[PDB]
Design a protein around this ligand. Structure first.
Ligand SMILES: [Zn+2]
Ligand SMILES: [Zn+2]
Ligand SMILES: [Zn+2]
Ligand SMILES: [Zn+2]
Lengths: 49, 243, 335, 35, 45, 102, 48, 334, 67
């Protein structure tokens, strides 16, 4: 039951969060260029770094 | 990855890479895709490459690091009472290098009865083999099982069981090499510090040296599990049926 | 179903890390773990309502009385000869449907050859011919076959080692399998640590022992037989190193475990496709393994390469090399 | 020099699929009468 | 040549185009084709 | 008639003094590498010796020799090959002189 | 790196388009042909 | 110290420690005329199938090398290709061909040359590099059977086919060269197969020579192994009934007792399988220190039949010599 | 199905000691572990070759064509 709900969870969080990206404006925008975040995380920093 | 063409009928990844696939060698299979265009071949090796993906994006923590049996053979070298002479040391340094990489032998840890090198001087040559190597790391870390020192004034590395690793100038002055400093969870790993200071290749080279040594060492040192490991002593057997 | 392997529980070569097991080359040469596959192939020479019948063809010779390549293993009556080697393209039943005869023989399409061992010519209930041809294939442990003990510890063959490279005791015994000590603590199979001693003390005594549930032979007098000879009580021996000659610095838990070889073999699992047949509706590569192939890249790895931002791989791996289609749109209509 | 160079490295690069990355960071890993 | 060992009678009988699959003297209707007379090479590995 | 492909010199590993050298010897194994590595390491001038078989599906072996600055590492290889032949001349001698005395 | 079986490497190709720089290299892969591994399965001409 | 230290949980002091630069006193150089003074061979027993001898005062790099030659690289003759004519037995043909290539043969391998691979398949097998062995048996129902009738030796004529049914056809000049020593299978009662009436085996086998690293059927020994001798140091002597149970902790001939309760003395410390059963008793620990001499090797070399087990050792030293000789006379391709 | 010719872990020939193993047990009977040592199988890798050998050639040969 753990194998199903692991894949099912990020597969539905994907369908809302596919087309969000960090722009050269430093904002995070959608497909239709509507602002989600003026800067990512409030500091602009990258969790992998 | 980069393909390598070998005579059997099976895919052979390295064992430090089987942690992101969350796989083991028990009969499961994988899927190899060969890209076909120059743009799709260059995006795959640069963005999806192993050396660039040595950290998970979830937290920026190492995910490709030492697996289960490369932590054991590494602990058994840098254990406090491993002492090597020139014949054993330079053979052990040739295991990790394939007889190609050049080494500058430090003066030994012990001089007057014999000439002996601790096992912590061997891993300090796995990080930087000679003076031409650029990797000079300075980290400071607690192991998994950390027995603290006797008094609380002795700082951290005066610990019992030798459980606080301090590396100064890419050389190991204390502490064993374990999951805490070679595994896949901590931002004070040895491999993490080589990546964050010197780049993805130098962290990959030091990991390939540790994979080759610990795959030749441990079959010539010997490590094994028996029934006397699991058997309780007869003063546990009396004290169990009291509690 | 299995063989008693001599098993040294130790860490060796770094090719036995996570459930892989180290194997002996000279054991495989003598018949350790060597198996055999048999496969049936039925054709029914059906007769039709047109009073015309399927026929078995003949040997097709060329230039003198020797067969062509596809009829080398055929014999005079069109059904392949028993004992002959068929390989990847030859014909072993040469049947023909209809008086024209449209040649529709069977073709052995396997990646490895296989000897005909049994050809059976009979007639079923409704009075029509029934040929069953059995095909035999011998196969030995390769890198990638699954072995297991009887304790749920499945494992794959990771390396095959030359037998002067294996560790050896004072008597000279080398293991058939080397098993990693890291499969014991997380899995807690202590009943495998008692199978080895009861196996070892029993074979030194000459008696088969018992490991039945809630009972069986006892560890405290399997360790009585084992000191009686001059072995250690705990089953741990002092093995030498085959590579460097020296004493190993640990005592090696060493004795016979019963290993069984599973049907999941890497010869029947390795497959690969460049281009091949396509499904006539979707004009994508086909399904299944026993086709040419096609490995599905679906809905969850697409997610993975979006997260890398690799956009031309995603264009290539999904469209350019799966189903690309040069189409003519109209600009004013859009159809 | 070290600390400032680590700070420019740490900024989110443009073009990254930061929503796709965040959607796999969450769904992937595994008092009284509460859920 | 003579071929087609019977199933349980173990008799020997060649077959024409359209005789039968009957083992004549037995009546049993399974016929095993006998071993070839050709040489078969094996390596002893 | 020399054998041009038995032993090489891995030029990507050597120094320019010749005091360090790697040698790719083919068709050899642990039986000849470990015997050399004992004998070569018994020079007063050899400061590093260790072989390694880099992949088991390659019938091949890399020996590494680093000396101090008084002997080329080819000369320490060629010395240590001679002393290994001198060893087996002793072992052939005392083995036959105890068989035929029996 | 990943170790690929040389029976899979014979069937999984790469469309190497010839240039000035790999003209001599790809000629050796033609003459080796499909059945030895430093080789090649197909050839697609400039126009055919 | 050349004594390996055996303790209850670990083994200590296992490495060579005889090179210059082990200590400040840079001793133990090569000095082949000093190795010649130190080296010594003792011959314990010598059979037509099994040698037992010591190699004293050498390194385990050299001693393991001699063991690895004898197992893997000393050549011998074994059947390689089998050509079946009419195998109608239950054992499959590739199984029976594996049972026939695995029997030993009494060919001397110095009477044959190595076969080739990069030559055509017609002039491949000359009479100097092959040996043709044929098996040809036919199982018939014995009419003169006793009416109890269960043991298949008096039920059928040739119900079992053994290895001494492998006859020898001398090809070419082998009817004069092998006129003195015919090829017999060195263990002639190897049960190859067993039959029932109607079933029949006929074949020829071609027997080339190879080494043990190719297939295990070419390995000349049944096991060539060594061991170091155990030394048993009875510190702080043991007497009385404690010496009676100190005797029992070893194999029986190893340790004697002189006059009942004077002391326990070690009698034949060669004889013990090291099982360190003394170290699990806390009474004798501090009153014994058992070890193992790293210089002193004890070879046991038992043959498969083809050649005498001291010629296996003499060839194996000669092979390791010719490896260092070949490599010294090869040019180093810079 | 029939006895292996050699021990797997040594290569000691054990195929000639199955016909003689059954005679030591059937007549002049021994307790299966001194009948092994009398045949000269010291190593336990070689004792397990014929002790745990189940002989299936005798049962397979009951089902042939009578021929
Ligand atoms: Zn339109
Ligand atoms: Zn019949
Ligand atoms: Zn065998
Ligand atoms: Zn054996």
């Amino acid at each position: 039951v753990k194998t199903a709900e692991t894949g099912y969870m990020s597969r539905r969080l994907m369908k809302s969060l596919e087309d969000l990206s960090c722009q050269y404006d430093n904002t995070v925008r959608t497909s239709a260029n509507g602002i989600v975040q003026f800067t990512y995380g409030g500091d602009g920093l990258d969790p992998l770094e | 990855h980069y393909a390598k063409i070998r005579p059997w009928r099976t895919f052979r990844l390295n064992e430090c890479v089987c942690t992101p696939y969350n796989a083991d060698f028990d009969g499961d299979e994988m899927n190899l895709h060969v890209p076909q265009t120059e743009e799709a071949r260059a995006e795959a090796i640069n963005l999806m490459g192993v050396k660039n993906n040595l950290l998970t994006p979830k937290s920026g923590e190492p995910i490709i690091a030492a697996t289960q049996d490369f932590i054991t053979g590494s602990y058994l070298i840098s254990h406090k009472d491993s002492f090597y002479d020139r014949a054993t040391l330079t053979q052990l340094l040739s295991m990790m290098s394939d007889g190609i990489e050049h080494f500058d032998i430090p003066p030994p840890a012990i001089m007057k009865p014999y000439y002996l090198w601790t096992g912590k001087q061997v891993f300090s040559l796995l990080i930087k083999p000679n003076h031409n190597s650029p990797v000079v790391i300075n980290l400071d870390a607690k192991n998994k099982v950390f027995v603290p020192p006797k008094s609380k004034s002795l700082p951290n590395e005066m610990s019992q069981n030798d459980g606080f690793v301090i590396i100064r100038g890419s050389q190991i002055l204390s502490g064993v090499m374990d999951k805490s400093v070679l595994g896949d969870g901590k931002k004070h790993s040895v491999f993490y510090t080589i990546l964050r200071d010197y780049g993805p290749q130098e962290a990959a080279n030091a990991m390939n040296r540790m994979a080759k040594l610990c795959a030749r060492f441990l079959g010539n040192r010997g490590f094994s599990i028996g029934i006397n490991d699991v058997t309780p002593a007869d003063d546990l057997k009396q004290k169990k049926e009291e509690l | 179903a299995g063989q008693n392997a001599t098993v040294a529980v130790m860490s060796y070569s770094g090719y036995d890390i996570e459930d892989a097991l180290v194997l002996n080359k000279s054991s495989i040469d003598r018949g350790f773990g060597r198996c055999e596959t048999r496969r049936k192939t039925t054709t029914v020479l059906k007769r039709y309502a047109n009073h015309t019948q399927d026929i078995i063809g003949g040997m097709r010779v060329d230039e003198n009385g020797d067969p062509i390549w596809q009829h080398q293993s055929l014999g005079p009556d069109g059904l392949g000869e028993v004992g002959m080697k068929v390989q990847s393209g030859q014909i072993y039943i040469n049947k023909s449907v209809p008086t024209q005869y449209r040649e529709a023989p069977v073709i052995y399409r396997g990646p490895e050859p296989s000897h005909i061992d049994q050809v059976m010519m009979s007639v079923s209930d409704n009075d029509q011919a029934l040929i069953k041809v059995l095909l035999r294939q011998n196969r030995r442990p390769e890198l990638g076959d699954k072995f297991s003990s009887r304790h749920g510890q499945k494992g794959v063959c990771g390396i095959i080692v030359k037998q002067e490279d294996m560790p050896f005791n004072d008597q000279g015994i080398v293991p058939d399998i080397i098993m990693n000590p890291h499969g014991f603590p997380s899995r807690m199979t202590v009943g495998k640590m008692i199978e080895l001693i009861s196996g070892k003390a029993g074979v030194l005594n000459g008696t088969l022992e018992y490991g039945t549930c809630f009972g069986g032979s006892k560890l405290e007098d399997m360790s009585k037989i084992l000191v009686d000879q001059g072995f250690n009580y705990s089953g741990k021996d002092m093995l030498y190193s085959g590579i460097t000659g020296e004493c190993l610095q640990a005592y090696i838990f060493f004795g016979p475990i019963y290993y069984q070889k599973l049907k999941h073999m890497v010869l029947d699992k390795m497959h690969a496709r460049a281009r091949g047949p396509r499904a006539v509706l979707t004009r994508q590569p086909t399904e299944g393994r026993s086709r040419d192939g096609g490995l599905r890249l679906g809905e969850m790895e697409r997610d993975c390469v979006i997260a890398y931002g690799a956009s031309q791989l995603l264009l290539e791996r999904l469209m350019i090399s799966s189903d690309a289609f040069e189409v003519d749109v109209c600009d004013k209509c859009g159809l | 020099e070290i600390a400032l160079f680590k700070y420019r490295k740490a900024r989110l690069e443009p073009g990254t699929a930061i929503g796709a990355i965040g959607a796999q960071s969450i769904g992937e890993p595994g008092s009284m009468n509460v859920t | 040549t003579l071929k087609y060992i019977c199933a349980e009678c173990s008799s020997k009988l060649s077959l024409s185009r359209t005789d039968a699959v009957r083992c004549k003297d037995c009546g049993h209707r399974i016929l095993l084709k006998a071993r070839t007379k050709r040489l078969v090479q094996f390596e002893a590995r | 008639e020399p054998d041009r492909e038995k032993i090489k010199l891995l030029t990507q590993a050597t120094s320019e003094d010749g005091t360090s050298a790697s040698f790719q010897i083919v068709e050899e194994d642990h039986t000849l590498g470990n015997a050399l590595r004992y004998v070569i390491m018994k020079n007063p001038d050899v400061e590093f010796c260790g072989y390694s078989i880099p992949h088991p599906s390659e019938n091949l072996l890399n020996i590494r020799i680093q000396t101090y600055g008084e002997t080329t590492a080819v000369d320490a290889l060629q010395k240590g090959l001679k002393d290994l032949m001198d060893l087996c001349d002793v072992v052939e001698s005392k083995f036959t002189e105890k068989i035929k005395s029996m | 790196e990943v170790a690929v079986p040389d029976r899979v490497a014979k069937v999984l190709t790469y469309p190497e388009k010839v240039t000035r720089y790999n003209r001599h290299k790809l000629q050796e892969l033609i003459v080796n042909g499909p059945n030895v591994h430093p080789g090649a399965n197909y050839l697609l001409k400039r126009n055919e | 110290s050349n004594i390996v230290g055996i303790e209850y949980n670990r083994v200590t002091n296992t490495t060579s420690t005889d090179f210059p630069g082990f200590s400040k006193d840079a001793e133990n150089e090569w000095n082949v005329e000093k190795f010649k003074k130190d080296f010594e061979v003792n011959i314990s027993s010598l059979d037509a199938r099994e040698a037992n001898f010591d190699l004293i005062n050498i390194d385990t790099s050299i001693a393991n090398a001699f063991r690895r030659i004898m197992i893997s690289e000393v050549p011998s003759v074994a059947a390689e290709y089998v050509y079946f004519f009419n195998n109608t037995s239950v054992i499959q043909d590739e199984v029976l061909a594996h049972r026939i290539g695995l029997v030993p043969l009494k060919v001397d391998p110095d009477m044959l040359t190595w076969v080739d691979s990069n030559l055509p398949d017609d002039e491949k097998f000359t009479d100097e590099n092959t040996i043709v062995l044929s098996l040809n048996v036919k199982c018939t129902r014995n009419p003169d059977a006793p009416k109890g009738s269960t043991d298949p030796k008096e039920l059928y004529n040739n119900a079992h086919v053994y290895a001494r049914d492998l006859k020898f056809e001398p090809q070419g000049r082998q009817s004069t060269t092998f006129a003195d020593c015919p090829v017999v299978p060195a263990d002639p009662d190897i049960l190859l197969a067993k039959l029932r009436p109607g079933q029949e085996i006929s074949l020829k086998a071609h027997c080339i020579l190879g080494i043990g690293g190719d297939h295990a059927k070419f390995s000349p020994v049944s096991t060539a192994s060594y061991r170091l001798l155990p030394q048993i140091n009875i510190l702080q002597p043991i007497k009385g009934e404690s010496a009676r149970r100190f005797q029992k902790c070893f194999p029986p001939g190893v340790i004697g007792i002189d006059e009942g309760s004077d002391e326990a003395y070690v009698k034949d410390a060669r004889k013990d399988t090291v099982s360190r059963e003394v170290l699990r008793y806390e009474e004798f620990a501090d009153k014994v220190k058992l070890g193992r001499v790293r210089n002193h090797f004890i070879f046991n070399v038992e043959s498969a039949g083809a050649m005498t087990p001291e010629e296996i050792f003499f060839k194996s030293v000669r092979i390791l010599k010719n490896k260092a000789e070949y490599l010294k006379n090869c040019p180093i391709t810079q | 199905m029939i006895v292996p010719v050699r021990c797997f872990s040594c290569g000691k020939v054990v195929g000639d000691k199955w016909e003689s193993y059954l005679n030591l047990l059937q007549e002049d009977e021994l307790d299966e572990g001194t009948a092994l040592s009398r045949l000269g199988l010291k190593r336990y890798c070689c004792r397990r070759m014929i002790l745990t050998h189940v002989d299936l050639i005798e049962k397979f040969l009951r089902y042939n064509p009578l021929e």
